Amino acid sequence: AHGGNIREPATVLGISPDQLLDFSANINPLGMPVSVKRALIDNLDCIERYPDADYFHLHQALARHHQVPASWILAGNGETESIFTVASGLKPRRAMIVTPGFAEYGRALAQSGCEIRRWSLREADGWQLTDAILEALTPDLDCLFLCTPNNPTGLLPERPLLQAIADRCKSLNINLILDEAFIDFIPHETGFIPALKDNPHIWVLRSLTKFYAIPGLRLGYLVNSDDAAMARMRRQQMPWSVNALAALAGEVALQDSAWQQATWHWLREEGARFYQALCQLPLLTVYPGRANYLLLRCEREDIDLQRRLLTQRILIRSCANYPGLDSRYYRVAIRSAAQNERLLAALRNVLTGIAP
Amino acid sequence: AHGGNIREPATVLGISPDQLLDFSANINPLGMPVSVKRALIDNLDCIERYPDADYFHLHQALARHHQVPASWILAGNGETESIFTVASGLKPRRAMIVTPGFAEYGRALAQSGCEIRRWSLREADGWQLTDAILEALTPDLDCLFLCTPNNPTGLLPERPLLQAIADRCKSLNINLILDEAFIDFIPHETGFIPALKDNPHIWVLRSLTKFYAIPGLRLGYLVNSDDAAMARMRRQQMPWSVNALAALAGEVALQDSAWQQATWHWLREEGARFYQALCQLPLLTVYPGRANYLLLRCEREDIDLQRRLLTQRILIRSCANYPGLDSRYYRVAIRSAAQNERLLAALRNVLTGIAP
Numbered sequence A, B: 001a002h003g004g005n006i007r008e009p010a011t012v013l014g015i016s017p018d019q020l021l022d023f024s025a026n027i028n029p030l031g032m033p034v035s036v037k038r039a040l041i042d043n044l045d046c047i048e049r050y051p052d053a054d055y056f057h058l059h060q061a062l063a064r065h066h067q068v069p070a071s072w073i074l075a076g077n078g079e080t081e082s083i084f085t086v087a088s089g090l091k092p093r094r095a096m097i098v099t100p101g102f103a104e105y106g107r108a109l110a111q112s113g114c115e116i117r118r119w120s121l122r123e124a125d126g127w128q129l130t131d132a133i134l135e136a137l138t139p140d141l142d143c144l145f146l147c148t149p150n151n152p153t154g155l156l157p158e159r160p161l162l163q164a165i166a167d168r169c170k171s172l173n174i175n176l177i178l179d180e181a182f183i184d185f186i187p188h189e190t191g192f193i194p195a196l197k198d199n200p201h202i203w204v205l206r207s208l209t210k211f212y213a214i215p216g217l218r219l220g221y222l223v224n225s226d227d228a229a230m231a232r233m234r235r236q237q238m239p240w241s242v243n244a245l246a247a248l249a250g251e252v253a254l255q256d257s258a259w260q261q262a263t264w265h266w267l268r269e270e271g272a273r274f275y276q277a278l279c280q281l282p283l284l285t286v287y288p289g290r291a292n293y294l295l296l297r298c299e300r301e302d303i304d305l306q307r308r309l310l311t312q313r314i315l316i317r318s319c320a321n322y323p324g325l326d327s328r329y330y331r332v333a334i335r336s337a338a339q340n341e342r343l344l345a346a347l348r349n350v351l352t353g354i355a356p
């Protein structure tokens, strides 16, 4: 049960989803780039033909964007498909995931028949990934999934720690899958694509749906420099999985040279202002997320924050279904100032004026 | 290597794909319904949110269309996804497919770890499915895939034979998967959805991409009346696989009450006129396909028809890669009269004036 389920949320209340303000999914509040919408409208008739099965133009655009060989890239029907593709293409016998984390890594691995080991983040560490994981990495592991920054904490592990993990993985023959779905939101963070050349054991997952606001179109991709392994992924993949409009949108989106700075500026300004306001609320712990969402811990047990905000027609993410987190945890997106203010006001009604 | 690969075909020639006339994919020549295009343009901003994970409106529309419980239906990112979903959801140990047939059944089963048995259609039978298959059906089979009408022959097995197969399957505990991807083109053919109520061993695959001309959007679905099995399919399925525009397009498409009659009329008129003209060509055998495509057998060995037509900038499907068919076999779509005439003229240049 993932976030962004507004139709389901509205159904629970008996109202139309157009009446809900959603903070349970984390999509760039700027909306899709104007050029993207124009291109979609202008080329809509392209849907009367099958997509290019090899997605030449799309992969060329992604390759030019990251300055890597097009052969290192495989686009997917959302990064969600890329996660299932890597799991099925690598068919690990034993794999480690880090909890709490995005639920699909586990679903994908389970379906592929893998023995899943969980590395548990600790509330006492403020949910930060630590070097304690290194000693937990063993030769018998085939894969390790890390999310950078993590869903739902928004925390980004230190580059040196990620490098230490990557190096250990290289020596223990472990494939390292880095989920960089939200990395574009963190100013100046390059991720690991610039370092794949001499590290064929590293796989990077990317998504265009949150940063460019096209989650309804579905577009993500996987990058890796092992010629043979990527070739195998191209087969284990279902044909025409990426729709023609997603491919077009992706190409156009990457051409908007102002999008990145505009998004970073918003995060640095409103995002910082929103975070400060949340931290001024009583009976609430707010974690220092680096992208467009924040993990919250409600210090009032006798209060289902999600149920309470839903009656106020504001949908938030309940993190109780993440392994490792309990009913006190929730996640909210960072949106436009006006919407953020409505969220804040709702939270105050449930948090201010209450004794410990 | 499926048909519709115009970008790849154009690349082989060193030209732009906009210069090719494609007869290698079989899409309704009328294009997408006008209401569908209007709805897509009017609701394009819906892509700024994730699709409804449960696709309520879409499944409700499909259920109303077939007058069956919405619980019997699962939409997919093209019927291609539905094929992979049924294979993975049923995880057959032994399964039978009929050759020649669409390549994805075999790919899907192979990936799921199934022992595949092939029932071979015979050139001496004019590639018709016969009752000889019944004795080949055994208790140890878990699944049987039939395509009605078949890709690439366009032949539709007799209802009584399909019923006999279905009944035998029911008694031998075999799941029967009927690929009805092209059934909408055959006037008055209802398929098996109207008969699923008391046959939970029957699974029907449907596609909206050829009949409504949205192969670039990707939309198909699976129907079955076994409560538990469909429930399992809803899990083995990847979340948000159907994009928001495909779901919208599907709902709108089903509301066009003139589309069906218009398409049937075209097939009965131009389709019949095209078929007759093909049959007047020398050194060519044309099979009696019932939908919008026809299988051709070139009686001139020393002539690669596809290569020869490609130089004339017309792309056709070579069926040499179908198990059971050799280099003499090709398939062509049935399109508009003008385009059909260009195809005919090209064929004449390669077939007329030549001695046996």
Ligand SMILES: Cc1ncc(COP(=O)(O)O)c(CNC[C@@H](C)OP(=O)(O)O)c1O
Binding pocket: A001, A002, A003, A004, A024, A025, A026, A077, A078, A079, A080, A081, A102, A103, A147, A150, A151, A179, A181, A182, A206, A207, A208, A209, A210, A215, A218, A219, A220, A317, B050
């Ligand atoms: C870390 C992470 N990785 C990959 C994806 C897949 O993205 P896409 O397929 O659109 O490219 C998501 C989406 N997450 C969407 C969100 C609604 O799910 P939760 O409430 O469980 O966080 C994600 O959060």
Ligand SMILES: Cc1ncc(COP(=O)(O)O)c(CNC[C@@H](C)OP(=O)(O)O)c1O
Binding pocket: A050, B001, B002, B003, B004, B024, B025, B026, B077, B078, B079, B080, B081, B102, B103, B147, B150, B151, B179, B181, B182, B206, B207, B208, B209, B210, B215, B218, B219, B220, B317
């Ligand atoms: C029998 C059959 N079933 C299912 C599909 C999948 O349809 P979709 O995913 O668009 O709903 C196709 C598509 N076939 C497309 C065609 C180009 O492939 P070939 O040249 O191998 O025949 C098909 O021919």
